[PDB]
Amino acid sequence: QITLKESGPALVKPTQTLTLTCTFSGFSLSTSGMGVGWIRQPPGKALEWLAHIWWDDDKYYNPSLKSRLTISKDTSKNQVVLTMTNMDPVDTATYYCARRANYGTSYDYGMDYWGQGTLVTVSSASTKGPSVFPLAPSGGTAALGCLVKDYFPEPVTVSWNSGALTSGVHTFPAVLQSSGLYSLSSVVTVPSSSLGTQTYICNVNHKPSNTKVDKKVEPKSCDKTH
Protein backbone atom coordinates (compact mmCIF):
# COMPACT_ATOMS: atom_id res chain seq x y z
CA GLN A 1 0.00 0.00 0.00
CA ILE A 2 0.91 3.69 -0.25
CA THR A 3 3.07 4.79 2.70
CA LEU A 4 5.33 7.67 3.69
CA LYS A 5 7.73 7.58 6.64
CA GLU A 6 9.86 10.41 8.04
CA SER A 7 13.28 9.74 9.57
CA GLY A 8 15.84 12.00 11.19
CA PRO A 9 17.41 13.03 14.48
CA ALA A 10 15.08 13.90 17.33
CA LEU A 11 17.69 16.42 18.49
CA VAL A 12 19.68 19.06 16.59
CA LYS A 13 21.92 21.60 18.29
CA PRO A 14 21.51 25.29 17.38
CA THR A 15 23.32 26.60 14.27
CA GLN A 16 23.77 22.99 13.12
CA THR A 17 22.19 21.29 10.10
CA LEU A 18 19.11 19.06 10.11
CA THR A 19 18.79 16.22 7.58
CA LEU A 20 15.44 14.49 7.15
CA THR A 21 14.54 11.42 5.09
CA CYS A 22 11.16 10.45 3.61
CA THR A 23 10.84 6.80 2.56
CA PHE A 24 7.79 5.64 0.62
CA SER A 25 6.20 2.58 -0.95
CA GLY A 26 3.21 1.90 -3.17
CA PHE A 27 4.28 4.51 -5.74
CA SER A 28 7.37 5.64 -7.64
CA LEU A 29 8.88 9.08 -8.12
CA SER A 30 9.85 8.03 -11.65
CA THR A 31 6.17 8.01 -12.65
CA SER A 32 5.14 11.23 -14.37
CA GLY A 33 2.98 13.54 -12.29
CA MET A 34 4.38 12.26 -8.98
CA GLY A 35 6.02 14.37 -6.30
CA VAL A 36 6.85 14.60 -2.62
CA GLY A 37 6.88 17.70 -0.42
CA TRP A 38 7.68 18.71 3.14
CA ILE A 39 5.47 20.53 5.67
CA ARG A 40 6.29 21.42 9.27
CA GLN A 41 4.09 22.27 12.25
CA PRO A 42 5.39 23.77 15.49
CA PRO A 43 3.50 22.42 18.52
CA GLY A 44 0.10 24.11 18.61
CA LYS A 45 0.90 26.25 15.55
CA ALA A 46 -0.31 26.20 11.96
CA LEU A 47 1.03 24.11 9.09
CA GLU A 48 3.85 25.67 7.06
CA TRP A 49 4.92 24.35 3.66
CA LEU A 50 8.67 23.97 3.17
CA ALA A 51 9.65 22.41 -0.17
CA HIS A 52 8.48 20.07 -2.92
CA ILE A 53 10.25 17.95 -5.53
CA TRP A 54 8.68 16.60 -8.71
CA TRP A 55 9.26 13.49 -10.79
CA ASP A 56 11.45 15.51 -13.19
CA ASP A 57 13.67 16.84 -10.35
CA ASP A 58 11.90 20.22 -10.43
CA LYS A 59 12.45 21.80 -7.01
CA TYR A 60 10.30 24.39 -5.22
CA TYR A 61 11.04 26.02 -1.86
CA ASN A 62 9.39 28.30 0.64
CA PRO A 63 10.85 31.66 -0.52
CA SER A 64 11.68 32.84 3.02
CA LEU A 65 13.54 29.59 3.78
CA LYS A 66 15.12 28.85 0.38
CA SER A 67 18.59 29.95 1.51
CA ARG A 68 18.57 27.19 4.15
CA LEU A 69 16.61 24.46 2.35
CA THR A 70 17.96 21.79 0.00
CA ILE A 71 15.65 19.11 -1.39
CA SER A 72 16.74 16.07 -3.41
CA LYS A 73 15.48 12.64 -4.42
CA ASP A 74 16.71 9.12 -5.18
CA THR A 75 14.06 7.33 -7.23
CA SER A 76 15.83 3.96 -7.12
CA LYS A 77 15.89 3.89 -3.31
CA ASN A 78 12.39 5.43 -2.95
CA GLN A 79 13.78 8.28 -0.87
CA VAL A 80 13.46 12.06 -0.62
CA VAL A 81 15.91 14.10 1.46
CA LEU A 82 15.49 17.61 2.90
CA THR A 83 18.44 19.53 4.34
CA MET A 84 17.95 22.58 6.57
CA THR A 85 20.93 24.64 7.73
CA ASN A 86 21.48 26.96 10.71
CA MET A 87 18.76 25.37 12.82
CA ASP A 88 17.18 27.86 15.25
CA PRO A 89 15.12 26.96 18.35
CA VAL A 90 12.04 28.32 16.54
CA ASP A 91 12.57 25.51 14.01
CA THR A 92 11.41 22.97 16.62
CA ALA A 93 8.41 21.34 14.96
CA THR A 94 6.86 18.16 13.62
CA TYR A 95 8.12 17.61 10.07
CA TYR A 96 5.81 15.84 7.60
CA CYS A 97 6.26 14.58 4.07
CA ALA A 98 3.31 14.21 1.71
CA ARG A 99 2.90 13.04 -1.87
CA ARG A 100 1.15 14.42 -4.95
CA ALA A 101 -0.02 12.41 -7.94
CA ASN A 102 -1.38 12.95 -11.46
CA TYR A 103 -0.28 16.59 -11.35
CA GLY A 104 -2.59 19.19 -12.87
CA THR A 105 -5.34 16.74 -13.88
CA SER A 106 -8.79 15.93 -12.54
CA TYR A 107 -7.22 13.03 -10.60
CA ASP A 108 -4.79 15.33 -8.73
CA TYR A 109 -6.41 15.20 -5.30
CA GLY A 110 -3.68 17.36 -3.79
CA MET A 111 -1.62 16.14 -0.85
CA ASP A 112 -3.87 13.17 -0.09
CA TYR A 113 -1.22 10.95 1.57
CA TRP A 114 0.91 12.10 4.49
CA GLY A 115 3.53 10.53 6.71
CA GLN A 116 3.26 10.22 10.47
CA GLY A 117 5.73 13.08 10.95
CA THR A 118 8.91 13.22 13.00
CA LEU A 119 9.54 15.63 15.87
CA VAL A 120 12.80 17.60 15.76
CA THR A 121 13.84 19.64 18.80
CA VAL A 122 16.47 22.36 18.36
CA SER A 123 18.35 22.35 21.67
CA SER A 124 21.83 21.95 23.13
CA ALA A 125 20.74 19.68 25.99
CA SER A 126 21.74 16.03 26.08
CA THR A 127 19.48 13.07 25.44
CA LYS A 128 18.21 11.40 28.62
CA GLY A 129 16.09 8.30 29.06
CA PRO A 130 13.01 8.31 31.28
CA SER A 131 12.28 6.64 34.59
CA VAL A 132 8.95 4.80 34.68
CA PHE A 133 7.08 4.60 37.98
CA PRO A 134 3.71 2.97 38.71
CA LEU A 135 0.54 4.74 39.80
CA ALA A 136 -1.09 2.03 41.89
CA PRO A 137 -4.91 1.66 41.78
CA SER A 138 -5.64 1.12 45.47
CA GLY A 139 -16.35 -1.97 43.79
CA GLY A 140 -16.99 0.59 41.07
CA THR A 141 -14.23 1.76 38.74
CA ALA A 142 -10.57 2.27 39.59
CA ALA A 143 -7.77 4.32 38.04
CA LEU A 144 -4.16 3.20 37.57
CA GLY A 145 -1.34 4.57 35.48
CA CYS A 146 2.35 5.14 34.88
CA LEU A 147 4.61 8.12 35.53
CA VAL A 148 7.18 8.78 32.78
CA LYS A 149 9.64 11.21 34.34
CA ASP A 150 12.91 12.99 33.54
CA TYR A 151 13.49 12.47 29.83
CA PHE A 152 14.65 14.65 26.94
CA PRO A 153 13.71 15.43 24.31
CA GLU A 154 10.11 14.82 23.33
CA PRO A 155 8.41 12.58 22.24
CA VAL A 156 7.39 9.60 24.35
CA THR A 157 4.86 6.99 23.23
CA VAL A 158 2.79 5.12 25.81
CA SER A 159 0.58 2.11 25.10
CA TRP A 160 -1.19 -0.24 27.49
CA ASN A 161 -0.99 -4.04 27.15
CA SER A 162 0.75 -3.64 23.78
CA GLY A 163 -2.21 -1.79 22.28
CA ALA A 164 -4.83 -4.25 23.53
CA LEU A 165 -6.08 -1.69 26.09
CA THR A 166 -7.24 1.59 24.55
CA SER A 167 -10.67 2.26 26.05
CA GLY A 168 -10.43 4.81 28.86
CA VAL A 169 -6.72 5.54 28.39
CA HIS A 170 -5.54 9.12 28.94
CA THR A 171 -1.94 9.94 28.02
CA PHE A 172 -1.27 13.50 29.08
CA PRO A 173 0.87 16.01 27.15
CA ALA A 174 4.35 16.27 28.60
CA VAL A 175 5.38 19.26 30.70
CA LEU A 176 8.87 20.74 30.72
CA GLN A 177 9.88 20.55 34.38
CA SER A 178 12.08 23.12 36.11
CA SER A 179 15.03 20.75 35.57
CA GLY A 180 14.75 21.05 31.79
CA LEU A 181 13.54 17.45 31.52
CA TYR A 182 10.09 16.38 30.38
CA SER A 183 7.56 14.41 32.39
CA LEU A 184 4.09 13.04 31.65
CA SER A 185 1.71 10.38 32.91
CA SER A 186 -0.66 7.91 31.29
CA VAL A 187 -3.73 6.68 33.18
CA VAL A 188 -6.54 4.26 32.38
CA THR A 189 -9.97 3.74 33.94
CA VAL A 190 -10.77 0.07 34.58
CA PRO A 191 -13.36 -1.80 36.67
CA SER A 192 -12.31 -2.70 40.19
CA SER A 193 -13.30 -6.34 39.64
CA SER A 194 -10.57 -6.78 37.02
CA LEU A 195 -7.80 -5.75 39.43
CA GLY A 196 -7.50 -9.28 40.81
CA THR A 197 -7.51 -11.03 37.43
CA GLN A 198 -6.50 -8.56 34.70
CA THR A 199 -2.86 -7.55 34.20
CA TYR A 200 -1.98 -3.96 33.27
CA ILE A 201 1.39 -3.14 31.68
CA CYS A 202 2.25 0.33 30.37
CA ASN A 203 4.54 0.11 27.34
CA VAL A 204 6.73 3.22 27.52
CA ASN A 205 8.97 3.95 24.53
CA HIS A 206 11.40 6.87 24.25
CA LYS A 207 13.16 6.55 20.89
CA PRO A 208 15.58 9.53 21.23
CA SER A 209 17.41 7.55 23.94
CA ASN A 210 16.46 4.14 22.47
CA THR A 211 14.76 3.24 25.76
CA LYS A 212 11.90 0.74 26.07
CA VAL A 213 10.18 0.05 29.40
CA ASP A 214 7.36 -2.43 30.00
CA LYS A 215 6.06 -1.70 33.50
CA LYS A 216 3.39 -3.81 35.18
CA VAL A 217 1.12 -1.77 37.46
CA GLU A 218 0.34 -3.78 40.63
CA PRO A 219 -2.19 -2.92 43.34
CA LYS A 220 -0.39 -1.64 46.42
CA SER A 221 -0.42 -3.52 49.71
CA CYS A 222 -0.23 -2.06 53.20
CA ASP A 223 2.49 -4.35 54.53
CA LYS A 224 6.07 -3.07 54.33
CA THR A 225 5.12 0.53 55.11
CA HIS A 226 8.13 2.29 56.66
Binding site: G37, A46, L47, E48, W49, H52, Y60, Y61, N62, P63, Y96, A98, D108, Y109, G110, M111, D112, W114, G115, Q116, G117, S131, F133, P134, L135, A136, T141, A143, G145, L147, K149, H170, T171, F172, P173, A174, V175, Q177, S183, L184, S185, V187, T189, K220, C222, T225
Partner: protein
Protein backbone atom coordinates in the same frame (compact mmCIF):
# COMPACT_ATOMS: atom_id res chain seq x y z
CA UNK B 1 2.67 35.01 -1.53
CA UNK B 2 -1.01 34.02 -1.46
CA UNK B 3 -2.37 34.68 2.03
CA UNK B 4 -5.19 32.40 3.20
CA UNK B 5 -7.28 34.08 5.90
CA UNK B 6 -9.42 31.62 7.86
CA UNK B 7 -12.27 32.37 10.28
CA UNK B 8 -13.20 31.80 12.97
CA UNK B 9 -9.91 30.83 14.62
CA UNK B 10 -11.89 28.65 17.05
CA UNK B 11 -15.50 27.58 17.41
CA UNK B 12 -17.65 25.68 19.92
CA UNK B 13 -20.88 24.22 18.53
CA UNK B 14 -23.29 21.53 19.65
CA UNK B 15 -23.80 18.06 18.20
CA UNK B 16 -26.17 18.41 15.27
CA UNK B 17 -25.47 22.10 14.63
CA UNK B 18 -24.57 23.41 11.18
CA UNK B 19 -20.94 24.59 11.08
CA UNK B 20 -19.57 26.97 8.45
CA UNK B 21 -15.85 27.74 8.19
CA UNK B 22 -14.64 30.61 5.99
CA UNK B 23 -11.36 30.86 4.07
CA UNK B 24 -10.47 34.04 2.15
CA UNK B 25 -7.54 34.25 -0.27
CA UNK B 26 -5.64 37.51 -0.73
CA UNK B 27 -5.72 36.85 -4.49
CA UNK B 28 -7.59 34.56 -6.85
CA UNK B 29 -6.67 30.89 -6.51
CA UNK B 30 -9.35 29.61 -8.95
CA UNK B 31 -10.87 26.44 -7.41
CA UNK B 32 -7.54 24.85 -6.39
CA UNK B 33 -8.36 24.73 -2.67
CA UNK B 34 -7.90 21.89 -0.19
CA UNK B 35 -9.62 21.35 3.17
CA UNK B 36 -7.92 19.29 5.88
CA UNK B 37 -9.23 17.80 9.13
CA UNK B 38 -6.41 17.26 11.64
CA UNK B 39 -6.68 15.48 14.97
CA UNK B 40 -4.08 16.53 17.56
CA UNK B 41 -0.85 14.58 17.20
CA UNK B 42 -1.92 13.18 13.82
CA UNK B 43 -1.25 14.17 10.23
CA UNK B 44 -3.97 16.18 8.47
CA UNK B 45 -6.70 14.16 6.76
CA UNK B 46 -7.88 15.31 3.34
CA UNK B 47 -11.59 16.21 3.28
CA UNK B 48 -12.15 18.17 0.06
CA UNK B 49 -10.10 18.63 -3.11
CA UNK B 50 -10.66 21.33 -5.75
CA UNK B 51 -12.76 23.44 -3.35
CA UNK B 52 -15.93 21.34 -3.67
CA UNK B 53 -15.17 17.66 -4.40
CA UNK B 54 -15.57 15.27 -1.47
CA UNK B 55 -12.62 12.90 -1.07
CA UNK B 56 -13.47 9.21 -1.14
CA UNK B 57 -14.64 7.98 2.26
CA UNK B 58 -15.44 11.42 3.71
CA UNK B 59 -18.93 11.51 5.28
CA UNK B 60 -21.52 13.36 3.22
CA UNK B 61 -22.07 15.98 5.94
CA UNK B 62 -18.82 17.58 4.72
CA UNK B 63 -19.21 19.91 1.73
CA UNK B 64 -17.20 22.70 0.16
CA UNK B 65 -17.97 25.50 -2.25
CA UNK B 66 -16.59 28.64 -3.80
CA UNK B 67 -14.01 29.81 -6.31
CA UNK B 68 -11.72 32.77 -6.78
CA UNK B 69 -11.06 34.14 -3.29
CA UNK B 70 -14.03 33.28 -1.03
CA UNK B 71 -14.34 29.66 0.10
CA UNK B 72 -16.51 27.75 2.55
CA UNK B 73 -16.32 24.44 4.39
CA UNK B 74 -19.73 23.32 5.66
CA UNK B 75 -20.46 20.53 8.14
CA UNK B 76 -24.18 19.89 7.71
CA UNK B 77 -24.70 18.13 11.07
CA UNK B 78 -21.81 18.35 13.53
CA UNK B 79 -20.71 15.06 15.12
CA UNK B 80 -18.59 14.31 18.22
CA UNK B 81 -15.84 12.72 16.10
CA UNK B 82 -15.57 16.05 14.23
CA UNK B 83 -13.45 17.66 16.94
CA UNK B 84 -10.34 18.76 15.07
CA UNK B 85 -8.45 21.72 13.70
CA UNK B 86 -9.59 22.43 10.14
CA UNK B 87 -7.17 23.99 7.66
CA UNK B 88 -7.65 25.41 4.18
CA UNK B 89 -4.80 25.30 1.68
CA UNK B 90 -4.39 26.71 -1.82
CA UNK B 91 -2.51 24.73 -4.44
CA UNK B 92 -2.92 27.28 -7.20
CA UNK B 93 0.47 28.98 -6.73
CA UNK B 94 3.76 27.82 -5.29
CA UNK B 95 4.57 28.41 -2.47
CA UNK B 96 1.57 26.50 -1.14
CA UNK B 97 0.07 28.38 1.81
CA UNK B 98 -2.27 27.50 4.67
CA UNK B 99 -4.98 29.27 6.59
CA UNK B 100 -4.61 29.91 10.29
CA UNK B 101 -6.94 27.02 11.05
CA UNK B 102 -10.27 26.68 12.84
CA UNK B 103 -10.14 24.74 16.11
CA UNK B 104 -13.61 23.19 16.32
CA UNK B 105 -14.75 22.24 19.83
CA UNK B 106 -17.85 20.15 20.57
CA UNK B 107 -20.28 21.79 23.00
CA UNK B 108 -21.83 19.12 25.23
CA UNK B 109 -23.67 18.93 28.54
CA UNK B 110 -21.79 19.55 31.77
CA UNK B 111 -19.88 16.54 33.09
CA UNK B 112 -18.33 16.31 36.55
CA UNK B 113 -14.80 14.86 36.82
CA UNK B 114 -13.89 11.65 38.56
CA UNK B 115 -11.05 12.52 40.94
CA UNK B 116 -8.20 10.22 41.96
CA UNK B 117 -5.00 10.86 43.93
CA UNK B 118 -1.78 8.85 43.63
CA UNK B 119 0.88 8.92 46.37
CA UNK B 120 4.51 8.56 45.24
CA UNK B 121 5.71 5.08 44.34
CA UNK B 122 8.33 3.31 46.43
CA UNK B 123 10.58 3.11 43.36
CA UNK B 124 10.65 6.90 43.02
CA UNK B 125 11.06 7.34 46.78
CA UNK B 126 14.07 5.02 46.60
CA UNK B 127 15.58 7.25 43.89
CA UNK B 128 15.18 10.34 46.08
CA UNK B 129 12.16 12.25 44.73
CA UNK B 130 8.41 12.20 45.36
CA UNK B 131 5.63 13.09 42.92
CA UNK B 132 1.95 13.15 43.90
CA UNK B 133 -0.50 12.90 41.00
CA UNK B 134 -4.08 14.20 41.04
CA UNK B 135 -6.27 12.85 38.23
CA UNK B 136 -9.39 14.58 36.89
CA UNK B 137 -11.23 12.18 34.60
CA UNK B 138 -13.79 12.96 31.87
CA UNK B 139 -15.27 16.39 32.62
CA UNK B 140 -16.85 19.27 30.70
CA UNK B 141 -16.37 22.17 30.29
CA UNK B 142 -12.59 22.46 30.17
CA UNK B 143 -12.44 25.07 32.95
CA UNK B 144 -11.32 23.45 36.20
CA UNK B 145 -9.28 24.46 39.24
CA UNK B 146 -6.91 22.14 41.13
CA UNK B 147 -5.53 23.21 44.52
CA UNK B 148 -2.89 21.30 46.50
CA UNK B 149 -2.87 21.23 50.31
CA UNK B 150 0.01 19.79 52.36
CA UNK B 151 -0.84 19.49 56.06
CA UNK B 152 -3.80 21.67 54.99
CA UNK B 153 -1.40 24.41 53.84
CA UNK B 154 -2.22 25.84 50.41
CA UNK B 155 0.60 25.07 47.98
CA UNK B 156 1.89 27.35 45.24
CA UNK B 157 4.65 27.18 42.65
CA UNK B 158 5.37 23.45 43.06
CA UNK B 159 2.74 21.82 40.82
CA UNK B 160 2.13 21.32 37.10
CA UNK B 161 -1.15 20.44 35.39
CA UNK B 162 -1.68 18.99 31.92
CA UNK B 163 -4.94 18.64 29.98
CA UNK B 164 -5.77 16.18 27.23
CA UNK B 165 -7.43 17.21 24.00
CA UNK B 166 -11.18 16.78 23.66
CA UNK B 167 -12.33 13.17 23.43
CA UNK B 168 -13.63 12.14 20.02
CA UNK B 169 -16.33 9.97 21.68
CA UNK B 170 -17.70 11.63 24.85
CA UNK B 171 -16.36 15.15 24.12
CA UNK B 172 -14.89 15.52 27.62
CA UNK B 173 -11.47 16.52 28.95
CA UNK B 174 -9.05 14.95 31.41
CA UNK B 175 -6.47 16.71 33.57
CA UNK B 176 -3.31 15.59 35.36
CA UNK B 177 -1.93 17.79 38.17
CA UNK B 178 1.39 16.70 39.68
CA UNK B 179 2.93 17.91 42.96
CA UNK B 180 6.72 17.46 43.02
CA UNK B 181 8.76 17.43 46.23
CA UNK B 182 12.10 16.06 47.30
CA UNK B 183 11.98 12.91 49.41
CA UNK B 184 13.17 14.94 52.40
CA UNK B 185 10.32 17.43 51.93
CA UNK B 186 7.77 14.65 51.40
CA UNK B 187 8.75 13.01 54.70
CA UNK B 188 8.36 16.30 56.59
CA UNK B 189 4.55 16.24 56.22
CA UNK B 190 1.78 13.66 56.51
CA UNK B 191 -1.41 14.97 54.83
CA UNK B 192 -1.48 15.42 51.05
CA UNK B 193 -4.67 16.49 49.30
CA UNK B 194 -5.87 17.89 45.99
CA UNK B 195 -9.13 19.85 45.94
CA UNK B 196 -11.05 19.96 42.65
CA UNK B 197 -13.44 22.81 41.83
CA UNK B 198 -15.56 22.34 38.71
CA UNK B 199 -18.89 23.55 37.34
CA UNK B 200 -20.39 20.05 37.43
CA UNK B 201 -19.70 19.69 41.17
CA UNK B 202 -22.17 21.11 43.68
CA UNK B 203 -19.22 21.66 46.06
CA UNK B 204 -15.44 21.19 45.75
CA UNK B 205 -14.22 17.60 45.95
CA UNK B 206 -11.05 16.62 47.80
CA UNK B 207 -9.01 13.42 47.54
CA UNK B 208 -6.31 12.93 50.16
CA UNK B 209 -3.99 10.43 51.81
CA UNK B 210 -1.75 10.28 54.87
CA UNK B 211 1.93 9.48 54.34
CA UNK B 212 2.83 6.43 56.40
CA UNK B 213 -0.86 5.68 57.09
CA UNK B 214 -1.73 2.93 54.63
Amino acid sequence: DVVMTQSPSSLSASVGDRVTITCKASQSVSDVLTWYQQKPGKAPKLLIYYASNRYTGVPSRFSGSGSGTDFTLTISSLQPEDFATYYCQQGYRSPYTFGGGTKLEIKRTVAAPSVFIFPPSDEQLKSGTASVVCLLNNFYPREAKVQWKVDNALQSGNSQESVTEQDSKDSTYSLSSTLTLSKADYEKHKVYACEVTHQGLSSPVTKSFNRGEC
